Amino acid sequence: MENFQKVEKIGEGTYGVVYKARNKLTGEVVALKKIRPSTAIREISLLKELNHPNIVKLLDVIHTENKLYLVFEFLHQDLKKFMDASALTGIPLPLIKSYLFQLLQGLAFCHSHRVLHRDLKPQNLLINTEGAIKLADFGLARAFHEVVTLWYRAPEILLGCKYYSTAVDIWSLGCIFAEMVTRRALFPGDSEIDQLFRIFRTLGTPDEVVWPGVTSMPDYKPSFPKWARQDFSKVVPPLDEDGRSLLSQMLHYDPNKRISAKAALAHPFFQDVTKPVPHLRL
Numbered sequence: 452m453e454n455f456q457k458v459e460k461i462g463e464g465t466y467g468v469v470y471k472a473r474n475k476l477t478g479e480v481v482a483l484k485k486i487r488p489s490t491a492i493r494e495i496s497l498l499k500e501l502n503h504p505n506i507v508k509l510l511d512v513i514h515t516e517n518k519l520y521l522v523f524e525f526l527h528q529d530l531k532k533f534m535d536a537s538a539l540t541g542i543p544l545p546l547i548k549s550y551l552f553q554l555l556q557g558l559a560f561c562h563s564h565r566v567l568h569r570d571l572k573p574q575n576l577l578i579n580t581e582g583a584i585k586l587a588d589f590g591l592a593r594a595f596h597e598v599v600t601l602w603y604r605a606p607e608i609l610l611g612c613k614y615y616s617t618a619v620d621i622w623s624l625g626c627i628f629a630e631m632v633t634r635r636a637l638f639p640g641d642s643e644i645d646q647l648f649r650i651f652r653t654l655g656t657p658d659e660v661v662w663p664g665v666t667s668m669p670d671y672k673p674s675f676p677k678w679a680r681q682d683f684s685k686v687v688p689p690l691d692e693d694g695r696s697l698l699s700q701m702l703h704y705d706p707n708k709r710i711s712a713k714a715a716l717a718h719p720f721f722q723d724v725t726k727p728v729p730h731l732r733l
């Protein structure tokens with residue numbers, strides 16, 4: 452759109468391409484997403500209102516000549532690239548902690564307004580030079596080829612629950628937490644059943660004891676194999692006891708048992724939280 456000069460393509464998305472761009476009438480540099488219903492219009496207009504330091508700012512919605520552009524604040528790296536960059540050494544735990552804590556704050560905000568992300572993944576998490584981490588694409592899922600990753604998907608989604616809650620985002624972030632610690636994807640599924648079966652092999656096949664109502668889930672099958680739960684000391688070493696306590700609460704099968712973002716903020720793991728600055732080279 453005429454008011455913006457593209458500077459570079461900064462990624463492919465689900466809904467379209469993302470450009471780094473410069474506004475001519477503000478001089479501001481940004482991230483310009485090109486998308487493809489008034490419902491979608493109203494939903495997005497809602498998002499322009501949920502402003503939080505840990506949510507990528509939606510600057511402007513441009514519904515011109517019947518295409519849709521979303522103008523966001525620009526950030527210089529995402530967490531996936533940073534992870535890949537930190538791999539030989541791993542992200543220091545104090546930064547993992549700070550990142551988790553900030554994200555939890557962003558979630559507690561979104562969720563308190565009844566807005567879910569639905570699709571948390573490292574690629575949707577964006578970082579700056581100042582030690583901040585922000586959720587991007589928040590709200591688009593409920594508002595609207597390269598394969599979409601299943602790795603972070605909550606089990607109730609995989610089992611065909613149509614009415615997810617805020618807990619699906621806690622799950623995702625817990626998968627993200629585990630991955631930052633270990634330097635390997637927690638559950639790298641390459642189909643819905645592989646993804647489910649990886650969850651099962653690690654946390655154990657859910658039943659009515661741990662997850663009441665699980666056997667009445669739409670895509671649940673009495674024929675699922677019955678794997679034993681592993682020890683968390685095996686899953687994410689060498690995360691401490693507080694860290695492992697927290698992760699287990701984020702990965703609870705029953706979404707009603709699963710810790711909230713707000714309760715997670717009070718967990719003892721955060722007793723000593725700080726705000727380190729990452730070494731990122733741009």
Ligand SMILES: CC(C)Nc1cc(N[C@H]2CC[C@H](N)CC2)nc2c(C#N)cnn12
Pocket residue numbers: 461462463464465469482507523524525526527528529574575577587588
């Ligand atoms: C320089 C770069 C890290 N800045 C980016 C990239 C980016 N890519 C999107 C691709 C599609 C994904 N589902 C989500 C991330 N998006 C943004 C924003 C936004 N919004 C701001 N900076 N960046």
